[PDB]
Amino acid sequence: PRKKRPEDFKFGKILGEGSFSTVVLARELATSREYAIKILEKRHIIKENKVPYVTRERDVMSRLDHPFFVKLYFTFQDDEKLYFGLSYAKNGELLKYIRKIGSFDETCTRFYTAEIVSALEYLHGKGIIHRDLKPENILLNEDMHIQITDFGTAKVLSFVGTAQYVSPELLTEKSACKSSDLWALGCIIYQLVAGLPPFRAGNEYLIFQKIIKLEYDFPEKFFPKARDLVEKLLVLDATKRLGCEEMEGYGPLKAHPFFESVTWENLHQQTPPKLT
Numbered sequence: 001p002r003k004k005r006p007e008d009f010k011f012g013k014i015l016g017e018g019s020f021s022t023v024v025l026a027r028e029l030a031t032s033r034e035y036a037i038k039i040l041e042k043r044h045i046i047k048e049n050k051v052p053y054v055t056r057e058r059d060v061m062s063r064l065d066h067p068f069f070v071k072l073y074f075t076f077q078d079d080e081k082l083y084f085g086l087s088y089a090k091n092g093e094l095l096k097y098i099r100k101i102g103s104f105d106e107t108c109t110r111f112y113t114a115e116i117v118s119a120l121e122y123l124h125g126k127g128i129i130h131r132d133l134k135p136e137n138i139l140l141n142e143d144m145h146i147q148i149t150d151f152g153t154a155k156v157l158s159f160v161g162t163a164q165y166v167s168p169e170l171l172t173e174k175s176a177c178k179s180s181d182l183w184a185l186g187c188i189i190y191q192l193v194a195g196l197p198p199f200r201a202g203n204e205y206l207i208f209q210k211i212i213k214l215e216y217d218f219p220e221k222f223f224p225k226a227r228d229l230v231e232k233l234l235v236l237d238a239t240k241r242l243g244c245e246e247m248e249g250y251g252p253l254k255a256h257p258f259f260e261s262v263t264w265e266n267l268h269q270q271t272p273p274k275l276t
């Protein structure tokens with residue numbers, strides 16, 4: 001399949017923006033297919049010593065083959081830029097729905113929580129750790145199933161993620177592992193139910209302080225079995241988190257009572273509950 005060029009596309013609006021990339025919507029002219037093309041400036045990447053992060057993202061996304069992950073269709077480059085052609089997830093980021101509808105009911109947190117848990121099992125089975133799992137990195141497709149993205153900063157068996165989601169082992173020995181993604185899972189569950197993340201404060205140092213002290217509280221309206229799960233996830237000792245190897249893996253995590261009624265085997269075949 002001949003390599004594609006910038007001229008093969010009609011480019012449109014900006015979809016997203018980070019410190020090193022811009023994601024733009026594009027229509028392939030020969031097929032009228034829409035893609036989310038991520039553009040990176042080679043000079044800026046180099047001067048910031050990011051080449052290893054860019055090659056890792058490409059290499060990881062090449063290995064993923066599961067419906068709960070954004071897909072890499074093609075790459076090319078011109079003189080100044082790299083181009084990564086990715087899935088266009090029509091409905092955008094999960095963070096927008098948490099803001100829009102404010103807070104999920106138990107049916108919806110349970111379903112979306114389970115899709116994220118299936119995703120992490122697949123990722124971790126490939127020996128890959130995300131290290132920056134968060135609502136902004138969890139997208140929704142036109143049919144309202146999730147697609148996880150942003151793999152530049154992953155570790156395939158140094159880096160700290162987003163303040164509100166970093167685990168306590170990062171704030172000490174500065175190490176990360178599978179248990180780290182499970183800590184962020186517990187944070188995202190909390191945020192699904194309560195509408196806000198567990199550890200908030202006026203600046204980043206104050207957040208890091210709260211995390212090591214495990215200083216947070218549950219609302220009274222918080223679903224009980226979902227509170228019990230969050231408590232088995234937000235644990236300071238990483239080896240004691242539900243779903244980690246030392247706790248015997250995903251078997252026990254999926255068996256939790258909050259997931260009582262879930263069929264784990266075909267989630268992306270199921271119709272998602274409406275958000276309200």
Ligand SMILES: CC(C1=c2cc(NC(N)=O)ccc2=NC1=O)c1ccc[nH]1
Nearest residue numbers: 015016023036087088089090092149150
């Ligand atoms: C931001 C965004 C999309 C992406 C962001 C991405 N960001 C990233 N850092 O990798 C990656 C892929 C992607 N596909 C999208 O459709 C989006 C917004 C609205 C619809 N899609």
